[PDB]
Write a protein that binds this DNA or RNA. Structure first.
Ligand SMILES: [Mg+2]
Ligand SMILES: [Mg+2]
Ligand SMILES: [Mg+2]
Ligand SMILES: [Mg+2]
Ligand SMILES: [Mg+2]
Ligand SMILES: [Mg+2]
Ligand SMILES: [Mg+2]
Ligand SMILES: [Mg+2]
Ligand SMILES: [Mg+2]
Ligand SMILES: [Mg+2]
Ligand SMILES: [Mg+2]
Ligand SMILES: [Mg+2]
Ligand SMILES: [Mg+2]
Ligand SMILES: [Mg+2]
Ligand SMILES: [Mg+2]
Ligand SMILES: [Mg+2]
Ligand SMILES: [Mg+2]
Ligand SMILES: [Mg+2]
Ligand SMILES: [Mg+2]
Ligand SMILES: [Mg+2]
Ligand SMILES: [Mg+2]
Ligand SMILES: [Mg+2]
Ligand SMILES: [Mg+2]
Ligand SMILES: [Mg+2]
Ligand SMILES: [Mg+2]
Ligand SMILES: [Mg+2]
Ligand SMILES: [Mg+2]
Ligand SMILES: [Mg+2]
Ligand SMILES: [Mg+2]
Ligand SMILES: [Mg+2]
Ligand SMILES: [Mg+2]
Ligand SMILES: [Mg+2]
Ligand SMILES: [Mg+2]
Ligand SMILES: [Mg+2]
Ligand SMILES: [Mg+2]
Ligand SMILES: [Mg+2]
Ligand SMILES: [Mg+2]
Ligand SMILES: [Mg+2]
Ligand SMILES: [Mg+2]
Ligand SMILES: [Mg+2]
Ligand SMILES: [Mg+2]
Ligand SMILES: [Mg+2]
Ligand SMILES: [Mg+2]
Ligand SMILES: [Mg+2]
Ligand SMILES: [Mg+2]
Ligand SMILES: [Mg+2]
Ligand SMILES: [Mg+2]
Ligand SMILES: [Mg+2]
Ligand SMILES: [Mg+2]
Ligand SMILES: [Mg+2]
Ligand SMILES: [Mg+2]
Ligand SMILES: [Zn+2]
Lengths: 151, 83, 127, 224, 100, 100, 211, 115
RNA sequence: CCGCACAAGCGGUGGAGCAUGUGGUUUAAUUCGAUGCAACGCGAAGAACCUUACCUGGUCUUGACAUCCACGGAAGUUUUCAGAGAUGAGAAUGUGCCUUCGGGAACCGUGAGACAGGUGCUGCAUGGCUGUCGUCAGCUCGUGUUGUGAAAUGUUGGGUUAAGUCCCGCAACGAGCGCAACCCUUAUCCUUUGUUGCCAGCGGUCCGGCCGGGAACUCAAAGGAGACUGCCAGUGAUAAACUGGAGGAAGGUGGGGAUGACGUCAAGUCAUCAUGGCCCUUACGACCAGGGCUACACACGUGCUACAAUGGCGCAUACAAAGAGAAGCGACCUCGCGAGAGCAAGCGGACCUCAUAAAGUGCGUCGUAGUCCGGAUUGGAGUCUGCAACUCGACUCCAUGAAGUCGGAAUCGCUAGUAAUCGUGGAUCAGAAUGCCACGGUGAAUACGUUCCCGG
């Protein structure tokens, strides 16, 4: 991307709920090209949150999303030949992407003898703003606030 | 491992040498190159000089060695260690 | 009284014959739930009738060869789209706007000499 | 052309007094509103002398090259050559067109080959993209060399509009000895024009009057 | 019986096509009805060899031999047609198998 | 390759022709599912006395033009080098650079 | 870098093959060996007959050799004797009934193989290479070649450091497959080793592909 | 329970528990259960003593634990003192089945030793 | 100013075990070559013997392979002994061809020389062939012009492109080699032909396109059609072009290949071949058996399998493509736990065989453990190929069950049907793939940008 900026590839909406957000989620935790293997974990870990953790699975998805979304991120760029940790603003769609990418990384360390159980547990815990996933967002914010001197 | 159907393999010249030896009981080392021959029971008590590619190692044959190739008891490579 | 459409996806060829009736679907002498174990494949096959809102007004007799179940589902969807627009011929704008007449031509890229796979390269040995 | 005929067209008009060339002093009536005024009295005999030489050249099978590269006046220069059956340059002048006649002849041959090939056929044998590309090349050559495709050899006379703008052409001509007939505004250097017409060249109407008189005189020469 | 089945193999389709054309032309001028040449799947035998005589292996080229097939069935042969066939010498590049 | 290598190859391919039938029947006797043990034993002992060069597995496909023992192609009988330089000269019927 | 053999990349596009027979795997390598030996013997015979190429067409029960040569009278001989003689011996090595046909290259100055062998024959008579190259080029251009390129590679004039010297007139587009590029390679075994000679001759683009 | 010796199978599925015993593998374990008539998925808990005794008596068919280990030590020693090539490589602690030793012989040579 | 060069991402390498190559060391020999990118799963598309060039020993001297001559015999064929074999010694047969009855031919043996032979040295004497910069966009020339001239201009400038692509400008105008196009393949449609392929409408069906039949559809493979910034809108210098839109299977060189300018590196190869020179010639040539190229304190490169619940195991059940086959691929059936064996049909193949794709899905189980993860290693027992598996083959079965709990500094690949993952096939080949070459299945993430590194 040096001459023309192509940008991110467009994606089909999720088959079960017709939502691009959840489709990108299954694309972002799919391993080795195993689409059905991943979405069978996704839909179960959302059904479990539907019945007990909240009232609606699709909206609980968002209430956990914006509960882990970061706002200001240090993207290290040397302006004039000095290591400057300049803080820049994330775009909305990249914000959602970072959020889901962090929530899947949180579910990975959960253990709990399952994958659906981990995803459900951490998606809930993040929706309540008390999850291993939210700490990385506030650490991004900590590192953004430390390096304010370079604005 | 050679097929049981085929049975044990032995070079014809070595078989005839061994017959002629065990007949008269020469008890003299048999200079052979047939490392690929199986040791048959009738070779027990003989001394067979098997070629290792540079010389003939005298293998004295016992009954524990029946069912093994002559080449198995003669080393070909020389390794005294790096140091 | 029978409308026909051919659909191809990822080396899969799907002959689709649509006629007015109950709404039953039969793929290679098998129901839709028998032939496709996944659910994404089922909804892909059903997307055109959903869009055009003719789900109980047509019976579908489908045969498909080649490729894999996901590729076959795309081929069946392309065939159904073609048969539909050959049925009504005014649904073409609705289907094209939904991207169902795309006939996506993505196919597997050949392996190339000096490459483990097309666009894959052996390790550079650190230097 | 009569002085009254020129004056109504505005032949007396010239460039600003800020922008003039030293040798043009004899041909300048004076100045008004900081504008150089060309003396029609000097212009009318010189224009008539140029016409008489052009008629003589035309009578002996003279090939005439009308020269002008002004965007607005390009069509008029092309039209004058077409009316009297002569050759023209209306697009930007190409350096060494007269001096490198051989290379121009190869370009003329290429233009002739492409047009002949399209009429003959084999465009179907060529790929549709190739046939379209050949048509684009033919069109580009036709605009550049359309006037001189049929000139055959080096021309016998040159008619130039705004001789300062076309200075390369006159330098070439003098290097070849080909005579130069040119409308010379006050800002031009008149050394290169053997039959010099001092007059406006920026105005299309003034150029049309000179071109029409020359084309009619050349046609009279052809009729004999 | 009265049924001929000829198979033509070649390395060039522009030669096998004219072979089939003239064969069905002959078989037709005697009034025998024939199935027009059935294009059977062409075989693409692919070879890949090293261009470098020594050291290089990554550098190599890929050659290919495409053998073309045609099938012509003559269903009701008049006994003049059987011999009228053998009076057809096809171009050296074509191979013919005649089964009955 | 050296001339002696090609001489070895032709000797091996000739010797394996005047012993093909005897070796075939001996190997048939040996691997016979039902046979006398003594008859099988004598077949095994007779199979050795034949010249060792008479077994077809001791031949090595060498390029006919040069004798190169590596890179041989059965379809042509030439190594990868002579195959290429004949192919580019148009000497191999049907062979042609491939792309797909 | 290295260039693709200009004749091989046009095989089936504008150039035809030098061998036109069909064989299955059982007979293929045998037929290749027989073609090789036929060509070798025919070259060793008609070296002085200026043969340009030898095409070989095998009918099922026979072999047919066409000899494109520049001096047909020499090879056909007096009352077709030597040619007939040739037939005999090729029928001996092909192990099959044979037939020899003679074709004349009307313009020997436009057939790359003959040009190459001409230049090598001069280089083996110690003609300086620049003269041979230049006069081959202009003899080809005279006779209507759109373009020609000649290249002599090796110890030119016996110099210890080898070098390649080439000379091109007109237009020789090597990357155009539509083009009719006639290319052949020869070599002169001079007192100081081998000198290679390559020669490309462009006779104009071919439309309609093979037809 | 001590089915084959001092080692005791775990309370997990019988087929896996039988495998835990030396000289018994998943195949042998299935054969032991089939002869006993016990299923493969029943645990060692919930199993009666008579059942475990028939398990012991079926295990007694094969050579297992020490009587097997001694047998495999003797087989190795036979080669080692026989002077055969394989015995030599046994005594030098090198791969005896023809694997390369220029590299990738670590599981017999043990951890790498610098110079 | 461009490039997976970086950034943004995804997955690796570096740790483990093994496979493989190299260095080193060892050895009687561990044959030779390739050595920064651009050597190190490289020559080698396949070292048990052969291959084989290496070593040990046994042997030959016009010779294993060629021509020439002389002498003696048809050629060929069957068996014995000695020997590891090479070889040495022997024993058992002919008369076909024109026969100017001379003899010559096919061959074999023997003698003498001219010679053969050399994978012997030089790739710093070479041809040919190849790598590399780099598929980077350049490299030049004619004529004109400019300058006293070496030279310059064109080829720079403004824009614009993947592009020295294109347009404008301009003493330049053109051209050549490049770039693009012409070629192959892929995506849509149409025409033609319909078996061994196909089955929509029909008649029966032993419910099998199987069988009457059908030529519609899939498909096959030959010929065509189609895409060109062609159409619209905006931006732009009324330019090129760019952005967007319509239509369309396809949209801006649609995707992929082939295609590699002038030259650079005295780059690689005298061991494919050819070749100047030098060198050996009862030996540096030739034959044979056995050994070696597979060694093993170590170091490096490239790979494979893993370390697990997105998973292991059991059972049940789906959907491929591309290929190969006659000393070949080898069904069905029987036997064997199994590798396989026996018997034996078919197929030179759209027919028959290789040949059941596997990830997938359904059910059950396992419960985070060095485990029902992992499979190294070793023991016992086998099958096949092959004269022959000791050194040193592959595979099967029983048992054994290492290290390994995601890998430091550093470093590699990749921009879409790509990465990742899952199987299938082929060449070489008696046998011997984790390599190489090809094929399909499932199938992403990210690209703000051009500061830095790397190369132009
Ligand atoms: Mg064993
Ligand atoms: Mg793939
Ligand atoms: Mg086939
Ligand atoms: Mg040689
Ligand atoms: Mg072999
Ligand atoms: Mg086991
Ligand atoms: Mg091994
Ligand atoms: Mg990066
Ligand atoms: Mg390491
Ligand atoms: Mg490692
Ligand atoms: Mg070494
Ligand atoms: Mg080496
Ligand atoms: Mg490699
Ligand atoms: Mg010796
Ligand atoms: Mg003997
Ligand atoms: Mg005689
Ligand atoms: Mg002699
Ligand atoms: Mg010599
Ligand atoms: Mg060099
Ligand atoms: Mg070197
Ligand atoms: Mg480029
Ligand atoms: Mg540039
Ligand atoms: Mg330049
Ligand atoms: Mg310059
Ligand atoms: Mg520019
Ligand atoms: Mg250009
Ligand atoms: Mg310019
Ligand atoms: Mg019916
Ligand atoms: Mg039809
Ligand atoms: Mg076509
Ligand atoms: Mg296009
Ligand atoms: Mg505008
Ligand atoms: Mg659209
Ligand atoms: Mg559009
Ligand atoms: Mg295209
Ligand atoms: Mg090109
Ligand atoms: Mg190349
Ligand atoms: Mg060098
Ligand atoms: Mg060397
Ligand atoms: Mg020697
Ligand atoms: Mg040997
Ligand atoms: Mg090796
Ligand atoms: Mg396991
Ligand atoms: Mg194979
Ligand atoms: Mg069974
Ligand atoms: Mg297979
Ligand atoms: Mg499963
Ligand atoms: Mg541990
Ligand atoms: Mg794979
Ligand atoms: Mg094999
Ligand atoms: Mg730089
Ligand atoms: Zn003016």
């Amino acid at each position: 991307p040096r001459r023309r900026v192509i940008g991110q590839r467009k994606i089909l909406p999720d088959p079960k709920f017709g939502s691009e957000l959840l489709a990108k989620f299954v694309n972002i935790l799919m391993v080795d090209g195993k689409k059905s293997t991943a979405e069978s974990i996704v839909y179960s870990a959302l059904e479990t949150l539907a019945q007990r953790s909240g009232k609606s699975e699709l909206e609980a998805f968002e209430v956990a999303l914006e509960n882990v979304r970061p706002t200001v991120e240090v993207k290290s760029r040397r302006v004039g030949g000095s290591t400057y940790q300049v803080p820049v603003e994330v775009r909305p769609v990249r914000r959602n992407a970072l959020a889901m990418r962090w929530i899947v990384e949180a579910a990975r360390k959960r253990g709990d003898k399952s994958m659906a159980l981990r995803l459900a547990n951490e998606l809930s815990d993040a929706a309540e703003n008390k999850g291993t996933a939210v700490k990385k967002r506030e650490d991004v914010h900590r590192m953004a606030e430390a390096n304010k001197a370079f604005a | 491992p050679r097929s049981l159907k085929k049975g044990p393999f032995i070079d014809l010249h070595l078989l005839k040498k061994v017959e002629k030896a065990v007949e008269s009981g020469d008890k003299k080392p048999l200079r052979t190159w047939s490392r690929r021959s199986t040791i048959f029971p009738n070779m027990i008590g003989l001394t067979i000089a098997v070629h290792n590619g540079r010389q003939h190692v005298p293998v004295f044959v016992t009954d524990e060695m029946v069912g093994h190739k002559l080449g198995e008891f003669a080393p070909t490579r020389t390794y005294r260690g790096h140091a | 009284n029978q409308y026909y459409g051919t659909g191809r996806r990822k080396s899969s060829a799907a002959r689709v014959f649509i006629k007015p009736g109950n709404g039953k679907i039969v793929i290679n002498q098998r129901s839709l739930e028998q032939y496709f174990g996944r659910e994404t494949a089922r909804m892909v096959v059903r997307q055109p009738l959903e869009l055009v809102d003719m789900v109980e007004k047509l019976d579908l007799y489908i045969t498909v060869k080649g490729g894999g179940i996901s590729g076959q589902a795309g081929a069946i969807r392309h065939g159904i789209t073609r048969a539909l627009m050959e049925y009504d011929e005014s649904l073409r704008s609705e289907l094209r706007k939904a991207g169902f007449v795309t006939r996506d031509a993505r196919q597997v890229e050949r392996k190339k000499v000096g490459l483990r796979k097309a666009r894959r390269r052996p390790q550079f040995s650190k230097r | 052309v009569s002085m009254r005929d020129m004056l109504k067209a505005g032949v007396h008009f010239g460039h600003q007094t800020r922008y003039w060339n030293p040798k043009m002093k004899p041909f300048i009536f004076g100045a008004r509103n900081k504008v150089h005024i060309i003396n029609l009295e000097k212009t009318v005999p010189m224009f008539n002398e140029a016409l008489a030489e052009l008629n003589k050249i035309a009578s002996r099978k003279g090939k005439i090259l009308f020269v002008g590269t002004k965007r607005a006046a390009s069509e008029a220069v092309k039209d004058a050559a077409l009316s009297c059956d002569q050759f023209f340059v209306n697009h930007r002048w190409l350096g060494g067109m007269l001096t490198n006649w051989k290379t121009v002849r190869q370009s003329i041959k290429r233009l002739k080959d492409l047009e002949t090939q399209s009429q003959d056929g084999t465009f179907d044998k060529l790929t549709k993209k190739e046939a379209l590309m050949r048509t684009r090349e033919l069109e580009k050559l036709e605009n550049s060399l359309g006037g001189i495709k049929d000139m055959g050899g080096l021309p016998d006379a040159l008619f130039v509009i705004d001789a300062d703008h076309e200075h390369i052409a006159i330098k070439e001509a003098n290097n070849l000895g080909i005579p130069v007939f040119a409308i010379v505004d006050t800002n031009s250097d008149p050394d290169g024009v053997d039959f010099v017409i001092p007059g406006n060249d920026d105005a299309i109407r003034a150029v049309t009057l000179y071109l029409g008189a020359v084309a009619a005189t050349v046609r009279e020469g052809r009729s004999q | 019986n009265q049924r001929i089945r000829i198979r033509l193999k070649a390395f060039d389709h522009r030669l096998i096509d004219q072979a089939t054309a003239e064969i069905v032309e002959t078989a037709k001028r005697t009034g025998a009805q024939v199935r027009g040449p059935i294009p059977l799947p062409t075989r693409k035998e692919r070879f890949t060899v090293l261009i470098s005589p020594h050291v290089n292996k990554d550098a190599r080229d890929q050659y290919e031999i495409r053998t073309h097939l045609r099938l012509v069935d003559i269903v009701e042969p008049t006994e003049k047609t059987v011999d009228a066939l053998m009076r057809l010498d096809l171009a050296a590049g074509v191979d013919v198998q005649i089964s009955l | 390759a050296k001339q002696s290598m090609k001489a070895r190859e032709v000797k091996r391919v000739a010797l394996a022709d005047k012993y093909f039938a005897k070796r075939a029947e001996l190997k048939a006797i040996i691997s016979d599912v039902n046979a006398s043990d003594e008859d099988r034993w004598n077949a095994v002992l007779k199979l050795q006395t034949l010249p060792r060069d008479s077994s077809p597995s001791r031949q090595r496909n060498r390029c006919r033009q040069t004798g190169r023992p590596h890179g041989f192609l059965r379809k042509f009988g030439l190594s990868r080098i002579k195959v290429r330089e004949a192919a580019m000269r148009g000497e191999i019927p049907g062979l042609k650079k491939a792309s797909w | 870098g290295q260039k693709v053999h200009p004749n091989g990349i046009r095989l089936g596009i504008v150039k035809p093959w030098n061998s036109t027979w069909f064989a299955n795997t059982k007979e293929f390598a045998d037929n290749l060996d027989s073609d090789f030996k036929v060509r070798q013997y025919l070259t060793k015979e008609l070296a002085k007959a200026s043969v340009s190429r030898i095409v070989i067409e095998r009918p099922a029960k026979s072999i047919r050799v066409t000899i494109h040569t520049a001096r047909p009278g020499i090879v056909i001989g007096k009352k077709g004797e030597d040619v007939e003689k040739l037939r005999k011996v090729v029928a001996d090595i092909a192990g099959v009934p044979a037939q020899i046909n003679i074709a004349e290259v009307r313009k020997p100055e436009l057939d790359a193989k003959l040009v190459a062998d001409s230049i090598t024959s001069q280089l083996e008579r110690r003609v300086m290479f620049r003269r041979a190259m230049k006069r081959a080029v202009q003899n080809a251009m005279r006779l209507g070649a759109k373009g020609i390129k000649v290249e002599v590679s090796g110890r030119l004039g016996g110099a210890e450091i080898a070098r390649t010297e080439w000379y091109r007139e007109g237009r020789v587009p090597l990357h155009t497959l539509r083009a009719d590029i006639d290319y052949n390679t020869s070599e002169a075994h001079t007192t100081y080793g081998v000198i290679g000679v390559k020669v490309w001759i462009f006779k104009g683009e071919i439309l309609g592909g093979m037809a | 329970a001590r089915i084959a010796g001092i080692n005791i199978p775990d309370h997990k599925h019988a087929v896996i528990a039988l495998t835990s015993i030396y000289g018994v593998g998943k195949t042998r374990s299935k054969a032991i259960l089939a002869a006993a008539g016990i299923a493969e998925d029943v645990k060692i808990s919930e199993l009666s003593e008579g059942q475990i005794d028939t398990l012991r008596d079926e295990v007694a068919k094969f050579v297992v634990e020490g009587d097997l280990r001694r047998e495999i030590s003797m087989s190795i020693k036979r080669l080692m003192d026989l002077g055969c090539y394989r015995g030599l490589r046994h005594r030098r602690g090198l791969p005896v089945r023809g694997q390369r030793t220029k590299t990738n012989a670590r599981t017999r040579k043990g951890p790498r030793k610098p110079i």
